[PDB]
Design a protein around this ligand. Structure first.
Ligand code: A1B56
Ligand code: ZN
Length: 139
């Protein structure tokens, strides 16, 4: 679990969005596993606007942060789950690092700010949904 709170927006994994997220919907994209809902309170986070390919992510299944080198956002095949049929997920970045399903929502940060959130993983891999292209989150 986990979310990004920036301005009057809450960014979550689409497959973990709550009834309240859907009732306050701003934007969602199944191909990215992202949903953004509106909030009444002002957020705590800021978004990176950069091309970093290294950073640090929070891994809830270890209660620890780990450094990672990750690929540029791209279209990657993701096998079927209870949440989605087998499909290509867009704007996904992969890295070598521990993850388990409950780790979705952990933040990836570089020195500039929030880069994205854990969205996929397995076998010593962890995948992050990028948010750096969503310029409207702070504009
Ligand atoms: C951190 S998630 C994770 C991690 C390890 C393992 S081992 C086996 N399944 C996983 C796993 N789950 C995972 O990749 N998906 C289930 C939730 C929706 C995801 C998506 N964006 O389509 C795909
Ligand atoms: Zn950066």
């Amino acid at each position: 679990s986990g979310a990004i709170y920036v301005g009057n927006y809450r960014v979550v994994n689409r497959h973990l969005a709550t009834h309240n997220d859907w009732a306050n919907l701003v934007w969602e994209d199944s191909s990215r596993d992202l949903l953004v809902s509106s909030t009444t309170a002002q957020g705590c986070d800021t978004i990176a606007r950069c091309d970093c390919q290294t950073g640090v992510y929070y891994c809830s299944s270890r209660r620890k942060h780990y450094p990672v080198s990750f690929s540029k956002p791209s279209l990657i095949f993701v096998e079927a789950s209870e949440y989605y049929p087998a499909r290509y997920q867009s704007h996904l970045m992969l890295a070598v690092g521990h993850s388990e399903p409950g780790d979705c929502g952990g933040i990836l940060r570089c020195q500039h700010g929030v880069v994205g959130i854990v969205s996929t993983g397995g076998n010593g891999l962890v995948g992050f949904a990028d948010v750096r292209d969503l310029l409207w989150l702070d504009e």
